[PDB]
């Protein structure tokens with residue numbers, strides 16, 4: 001039993017809700033919140049911008065030190081950093097950004113990072129400003145992630161479309 005509430009069950013291990021991931025994280029304080037990161041951990045907009053703003057820019061300060069030490073992530077890769085006031089940990093995962101021409105096949109590799117964590121609160125990778133089809137992202141999620149994932153979808157119209165079209 002866990003504290004996640006109001007989710008629709010899609011499969012044995014994948015759940016979905018129309019929710020603001022920032023507000024959901026603030027309320028649940030999950031062990032892991034996933035950020036829709038880029039390779040530079042520049043949290044300017046989208047989910048990353050929102051999560052970072054909610055940490056009063058502490059996420060960005062920590063991220064800048066991480067990059068200065070380690071260099072950029074790979075597309076499809078991840079790193080574990082602090083969850084600040086939102087979660088114990090933040091798993092920064094880089095899905096491919098279609099608006100930069102990155103290979104969508106890397107979306108499966110990106111979701112594989114979730115399997116290193118038993119339970120996660122997460123957005124749909126490569127959705128939103130990353131330019132991928134969120135229906136495709138949900139399909140890859142369900143077919144790749146084996147651990148327990150609670151998906152927060154900000155847009156109510158999109159949430160209803162994702163549910164109604166789910167196979």
Ligand SMILES: CNS(=O)(=O)c1cc(C(=O)N2CCc3nc(N)ncc3C2)co1
Pocket residue numbers: 019020021022046047048050122123124152153154
């Ligand atoms: C209250 N001030 S606000 O400017 O109107 C406002 C901005 C945002 C926001 O940018 N995001 C990022 C996109 C997003 N994606 C998921 N999956 N979940 C949550 C979010 C929230 C929310 O609220």
